[PDB]
Design a binder for these strands. Structure first.
Length: 164
DNA sequence: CGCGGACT
């Protein structure tokens, strides 16, 4: 809904998530979780401590479109049940390391053509589509970007009402 | 010997 979608985005930190394949993104939302690299794992634990909400905006590499956005719900931990990610060349399973469990808010895609007017002040005012994995998006640019996705009636806002 | 590495 439009009433409380802005409530979960208030005082939040946004992070662009890149994936060299769409399979792991499909595995991401099918499992409702995600895992990233140690350098980005460090900063995402930093953001979870200081933000009312940490939004991960997913964009498959070389896809020309976003695949939705989700909310970080917990820090990363090791030793859990294994996830069979499609490892990019030169990436081991230990690189994934900690396990991030997220809550998806919108699963509908968004082409880059619809977000060309949005520039990220924290990436030299470049269009928000441009950026590596873990690139933080400024509050306003991230909030306006989340609003341009089509409404996902399959997801309700009552679940993540007060998970904080 | 497996040793790398998720922008547009």
């Amino acid at each position: 809904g439009t009433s409380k979608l802005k409530y979960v985005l208030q005082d939040a930190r946004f992070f662009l998530i890149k994936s060299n394949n769409h399979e792991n993104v499909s595995l991401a939302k099918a499992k409702g979780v995600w895992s990233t690299l140690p350098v980005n794992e460090k900063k995402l634990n930093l953001a979870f401590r200081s933000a009312r909400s940490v939004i991960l905006i997913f964009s498959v590499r070389e896809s020309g479109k976003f695949q939705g956005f989700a909310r970080l719900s917990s820090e990363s931990h090791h030793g859990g049940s294994p996830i069979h990610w499609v490892l990019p060349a030169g990436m081991s399973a230990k690189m994934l390391g900690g396990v991030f469990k997220i809550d998806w808010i919108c699963r509908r895609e968004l082409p880059f053509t619809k977000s060309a007017h949005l520039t990220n002040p924290w990436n030299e005012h470049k269009p928000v589509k441009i950026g590596r994995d873990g690139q933080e998006i400024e509050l306003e640019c991230g909030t306006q970007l989340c609003l341009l996705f089509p409404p996902d009636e399959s997801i309700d806002l009552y679940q993540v009402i007060h998970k904080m």
